[PDB]
């Protein structure tokens, strides 16, 4: 609907500092690369 992406990574549409933990699980958890509000895939 709109160009915010609405995502762990994003409030109500700016995208959480690169380098913020958005999803912090047991089995894993993933990162901000400042670029999309899709937590990507690549844990570290």
């Not at 915010?4 to 690369?33: E, F, I, N």
């Amino acid at each position: 609907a709109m160009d915010c992406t609405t995502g762990p990574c994003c409030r109500q549409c700016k995208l959480k500092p690169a380098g913020t933990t958005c999803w912090k699980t047991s089995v894993s958890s993933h990162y901000c690369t400042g670029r999309s509000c899709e937590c990507p895939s690549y844990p570290g």
